[PDB]
Design an enzyme around this catalytic site. Structure first.
Site, PDB file in Angstrom:
ATOM      1  CG  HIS A   1      -4.278  -1.656   8.897  1.00  0.00           C
ATOM      2  ND1 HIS A   1      -4.471  -2.671   7.984  1.00  0.00           N
ATOM      3  CD2 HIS A   1      -3.988  -2.204  10.101  1.00  0.00           C
ATOM      4  CE1 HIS A   1      -4.258  -3.793   8.649  1.00  0.00           C
ATOM      5  NE2 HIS A   1      -3.985  -3.559   9.929  1.00  0.00           N
TER       6      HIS A   1
ATOM      7  CG  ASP B   1      -6.317  -0.442   4.687  1.00  0.00           C
ATOM      8  OD1 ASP B   1      -6.060  -1.436   5.387  1.00  0.00           O
ATOM      9  OD2 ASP B   1      -5.463   0.163   4.016  1.00  0.00           O
TER      10      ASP B   1
ATOM     11  CG  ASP C   1      -4.844  -3.097   2.523  1.00  0.00           C
ATOM     12  OD1 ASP C   1      -4.825  -4.354   2.394  1.00  0.00           O
ATOM     13  OD2 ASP C   1      -4.118  -2.475   3.353  1.00  0.00           O
TER      14      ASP C   1
ATOM     15  CG  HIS D   1       2.649  -1.641   4.429  1.00  0.00           C
ATOM     16  ND1 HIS D   1       2.025  -2.872   4.313  1.00  0.00           N
ATOM     17  CD2 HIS D   1       3.189  -1.544   5.667  1.00  0.00           C
ATOM     18  CE1 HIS D   1       2.176  -3.465   5.483  1.00  0.00           C
ATOM     19  NE2 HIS D   1       2.889  -2.712   6.324  1.00  0.00           N
TER      20      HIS D   1
ATOM     21  CG  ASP E   1      -5.315  -5.172   5.362  1.00  0.00           C
ATOM     22  OD1 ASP E   1      -6.123  -4.255   5.174  1.00  0.00           O
ATOM     23  OD2 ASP E   1      -4.164  -4.986   5.783  1.00  0.00           O
TER      24      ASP E   1
ATOM     25  CG  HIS F   1      -2.395   0.488   0.738  1.00  0.00           C
ATOM     26  ND1 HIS F   1      -3.494   0.272   1.541  1.00  0.00           N
ATOM     27  CD2 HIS F   1      -2.801   1.111  -0.393  1.00  0.00           C
ATOM     28  CE1 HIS F   1      -4.520   0.797   0.894  1.00  0.00           C
ATOM     29  NE2 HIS F   1      -4.154   1.299  -0.278  1.00  0.00           N
TER      30      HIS F   1
ATOM     31  CG  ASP G   1      -2.572   1.979   5.344  1.00  0.00           C
ATOM     32  OD1 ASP G   1      -2.597   1.293   6.380  1.00  0.00           O
ATOM     33  OD2 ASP G   1      -2.922   1.545   4.218  1.00  0.00           O
TER      34      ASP G   1
ATOM     35  CD  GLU H   1      -0.208  -4.268   1.781  1.00  0.00           C
ATOM     36  OE1 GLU H   1       0.383  -5.360   1.932  1.00  0.00           O
ATOM     37  OE2 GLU H   1       0.338  -3.163   2.005  1.00  0.00           O
TER      38      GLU H   1
HETATM   39  N1  LIG Z   1      -0.198   0.702  11.615  1.00  0.00           N
HETATM   40  C1  LIG Z   1       0.661  -0.435  11.247  1.00  0.00           C
HETATM   41  C2  LIG Z   1       2.074  -0.017  10.743  1.00  0.00           C
HETATM   42  O1  LIG Z   1       2.961  -0.806  10.447  1.00  0.00           O
HETATM   43  O2  LIG Z   1       2.229   1.282  10.686  1.00  0.00           O
HETATM   44  C3  LIG Z   1       0.984  -1.339  12.461  1.00  0.00           C
HETATM   45  C4  LIG Z   1       0.478  -2.765  12.179  1.00  0.00           C
HETATM   46  C5  LIG Z   1       1.349  -3.863  12.803  1.00  0.00           C
HETATM   47  C6  LIG Z   1       0.714  -4.278  14.129  1.00  0.00           C
HETATM   48  C7  LIG Z   1      -0.582  -3.489  14.229  1.00  0.00           C
HETATM   49  N2  LIG Z   1      -0.881  -3.054  12.820  1.00  0.00           N
HETATM   50  C8  LIG Z   1       0.373  -2.814  10.648  1.00  0.00           C
HETATM   51  C9  LIG Z   1      -0.013  -1.407  10.182  1.00  0.00           C
HETATM   52  C10 LIG Z   1       0.318  -1.137   8.706  1.00  0.00           C
HETATM   53  C11 LIG Z   1      -0.747  -1.594   7.711  1.00  0.00           C
HETATM   54  C12 LIG Z   1      -0.465  -1.173   6.268  1.00  0.00           C
HETATM   55  B1  LIG Z   1      -1.556  -1.749   5.320  1.00  0.00           B
HETATM   56  O3  LIG Z   1      -1.508  -3.197   5.289  1.00  0.00           O
HETATM   57  O4  LIG Z   1      -2.971  -1.414   5.640  1.00  0.00           O
HETATM   58  O5  LIG Z   1      -1.389  -1.250   3.927  1.00  0.00           O
HETATM   59 MN   LIG Z   2      -3.324  -0.478   3.526  1.00  0.00          MN
HETATM   60 MN   LIG Z   3      -4.502  -2.730   5.760  1.00  0.00          MN
END
Ligand SMILES: N[C@@]1(C(=O)O)C[C@]2(CCCN2)C[C@@H]1CCC[B-](O)(O)O
Ligand SMILES: [Mn+2]
Ligand SMILES: [Mn+2]
Ligand SMILES: N[C@@]1(C(=O)O)C[C@]2(CCCN2)C[C@@H]1CCC[B-](O)(O)O
Ligand SMILES: N[C@@]1(C(=O)O)C[C@]2(CCCN2)C[C@@H]1CCC[B-](O)(O)O
Ligand SMILES: [Mn+2]
Ligand SMILES: [Mn+2]
Ligand SMILES: [Mn+2]
Ligand SMILES: [Mn+2]
Lengths: 317, 317, 317
Positions: B124, B122, B230, B139, B232, B99, B126, B275
């Site tokens: 998240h 998503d 995304d 990401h 997820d 992402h 991000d 993703e």
């Molecule tokens: N806020 C996190 C980070 O690494 O900054 C912490 C994380 C790891 C443990 C809790 N969630 C993943 C997330 C990142 C998602 C990116 B994507 O998959 O939605 O594109």
């Molecule tokens: Mn994402």
């Molecule tokens: Mn995500």
């Protein structure tokens, strides 16, 4: 914060039902890091340890009602512990154990806060009286002993002379119902108890259900909330390790939505996490899944929101 | 039709996160026959190929932020390509890849259509900045680089000097959130960003979520829409082969609903399918299940409707 | 009670589709204990037995339409049996068998009740004509043989001379559609048939879906309801042992809510439980699951409710 001050009581009791293993629930919930997780969520947690339920040999049936003295004494001793935690200004967190323990948990809670309202998340009503019950299992009877309107319908069961009905039919809301006995349905409809069976959740959606539940209980005035969560309230695809699973249950999301909305009132005062049985898993994964869902439901009762959480500090400095 | 005129861009990049295999997302989406199915849906499809991402030797970290020059260059090159697709009157369809690439996909799209509105599906947000991040995986940071309100809160990170924030806090809607960091949750609140976490979806239902999202973005007048999807965002029961799965996600149905609704406005202008990690399936079927869902999601963005589809002819002759 | 007076008809027919095993559907539904479960539910149940479908050799295809003479004959036999059951004042309960039998089931029911309204629960519209079909399988064509508006678009198919369209486009409601052919989509829209594809179920929720369905059919005045249930209307996770499964179907809960709402009208007059194929379960567990779900659906049609049920007596005595 009041909504994040907790007193954990371990109630390792199984004799309210026939399946061994439910007494391991307090052990498995603790081992999954519940205490540590609650403290990471800015909670003030005091662990009151596991109640010793000293053996009651010679506990013959009352008619068809099994282990009445053991069930009565476990609930009697739990009521005393819950009252002690409530007096210490803490939200009582009862880790079960079978649902017969709600007799003691709610009685003990009502001792300190008699104005409390009950939210009962379960596939079953658990409202059988010792006379309407066909299984003789006391975990399907806790509500009958607690309701004021059923006084005169409860016979004199050995081990329950300490019981005084503390909740009125209008102060309880059921959510997740899908397996109700004929006698139980008759009680439910005659007493006019407010309920949201899986039919109502399907009809209205969980948003409207919680909106109606909290208005129904807190509309006249703000009062303490006792949540009694039977893990079989959720679909067995989320909590398979339980004694009496019923298909077509509340989803994982739905379970979190109820607990998220209850936390937000700021009035949660007592919580029961019941019927987790770590020896009823078909695989070691069904056990971890049940325990993780139970832990997730608990954390949401104490503030964990899916939208996220943050402390009152400037995260950009 | 403008809503069925597509420019395919493969973005086989993984250095925005530590788990290998997500760079294989374009290949497996292509193998499943995405381009053929789109053409079978009466789409005008032009394939701009998969972008070549040259390995950056000595890509030293910026504080705890990993591979900054690689992520910066991959997004810089993607921005140029998205802007080229958009200038040809086609809807850019980015096949990822992690992402972090959304930096370039959205920046590129804003170079041709600066009045764009972003739907971010998503688990998240991000929206971590290089300083708020605790993982250092880019990401989880693309929205911070894109937001105008965060200019001055983002330091000079190697590989990102080409970036100019192109969207305001009011031009983005999140759908599906259930795992948000404290600092991200703080940004979400202080910048007053519109979001529908899984809590709002449970409360309102995906019908109301989509009504409000489109009313929020299109209310004043029609404007181009960028959907950053995304996988997820959907429950790991439907998309398990992904790096950051989170239980209790959007259903297969809700996902199709969102995309079928965005299609109907006729305003889809940019799309990201991100993703998908085919090395992260526990079974070969977990990989096919993820890819099948991601393909189904993409097909609905371009007209495939569950009620059906037909050519403007007379079928009864 | 009339809504609990049942006439069971077993239809062990499979020549309407190419997958062997659906003829074993009435047997596995009987072996599960369907009749016994209905009797315990206070239902006046009469077994009319299984119809003897004589093998027709040299059944040459009509253009592309496979087994025309066998399909027409079976439905002709079922039409006389359903009409007999209806004249005896019982609700016809057809145990399928592939969905081509809906020709005979609805036709026989309209012979006694011509003002009937149809609720077609299916992933598919089954509205192809012998000229629009690309499969030539008659289980995806029964609605075309029954609609009065398609008279002149149905050619002389051997074995179907006895047929006389018994319903208008306005007398049928679809629920659960998600795999509609282009020819079918054209028919669905040009005839202006009422439908709730999975998109409308996601948008409205099953509560509003049932509200709208029942209002559209019963608005003007009370009329008999014929429910033709293709078990593939439900998601493959609840009914996997079926010939044409489509992902993103109705949940177990929605299935129960549809059938509970239909019982509550007291106007259920006909019921088809079709396409259960015990030979198509990936494991013996997938077969049992499908059959158990199909039994749960049928019991709800005749009053089994998730909130509970009770006889007219004082249970507290
Ligand atoms: N806020 C996190 C980070 O690494 O900054 C912490 C994380 C790891 C443990 C809790 N969630 C993943 C997330 C990142 C998602 C990116 B994507 O998959 O939605 O594109
Ligand atoms: Mn994402
Ligand atoms: Mn995500
Ligand atoms: N109503 C029942 C009873 O025994 O009184 C009959 C029962 C046995 C078969 C049908 N459901 C279990 C239930 C008891 C549940 C207790 B608990 O899990 O919710 O705590
Ligand atoms: N429209 C179809 C047809 O053959 O006419 C094409 C089909 C084959 C592949 C895509 N769906 C099956 C469907 C028929 C369903 C029958 B039934 O299961 O709902 O009863
Ligand atoms: Mn219970
Ligand atoms: Mn229960
Ligand atoms: Mn069908
Ligand atoms: Mn079907």
């Amino acid at each position: 914060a009041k909504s994040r001050t907790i007193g954990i009581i371990g109630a390792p009791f199984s004799k309210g039902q026939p399946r061994g293993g439910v007494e391991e629930g307090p052990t498995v919930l603790r081992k999954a890091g519940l205490l540590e997780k609650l403290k990471e969520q800015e909670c003030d947690v005091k662990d009151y340890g596991d109640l010793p339920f000293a053996d009651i040999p010679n506990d013959s049936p009352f008619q068809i009602v099994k282990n009445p003295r053991s069930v009565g004494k476990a609930s009697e001793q739990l009521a005393g512990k819950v009252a002690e935690v409530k007096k210490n200004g803490r939200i009582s967190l009862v880790l079960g154990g079978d649902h017969s323990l709600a007799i003691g948990s709610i009685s003990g809670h009502a001792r300190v806060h008699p104005d409390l309202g009950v939210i009962w998340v379960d596939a079953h009503t658990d409202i059988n009286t010792p006379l309407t019950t066909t299984s003789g299992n006391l975990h399907g009877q806790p509500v009958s002993f607690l309701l004021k309107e059923l006084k005169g319908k409860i016979p004199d069961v050995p081990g329950f002379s300490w019981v005084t009905p503390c909740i009125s039919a209008k102060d309880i809301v059921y959510i997740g119902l899908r397996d109700v006995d004929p006698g139980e349905h008759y009680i439910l409809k005659t007493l006019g108890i407010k309920y949201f069976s899986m039919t109502e959740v399907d009809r209205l959606g969980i948003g409207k259900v919680m909106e109606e539940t909290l208005s129904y209980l807190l509309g006249r005035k703000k009062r303490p909330i006792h949540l009694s969560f039977d893990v079989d309230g959720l679909d067995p695809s989320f909590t398979p390790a339980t004694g009496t699973p019923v298909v077509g249950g509340l989803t994982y999301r739905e379970g979190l939505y109820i607990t998220e909305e209850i936390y937000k009132t700021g009035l949660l005062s007592g919580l029961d996490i019941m019927e987790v049985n770590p020896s009823l898993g078909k695989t070691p994964e069904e056990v971890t899944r049940t325990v993780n869902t139970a832990v997730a439901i608990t954390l949401a009762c104490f503030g964990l929101a899916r939208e996220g959480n943050h402390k009152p500090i400037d995260y950009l400095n």
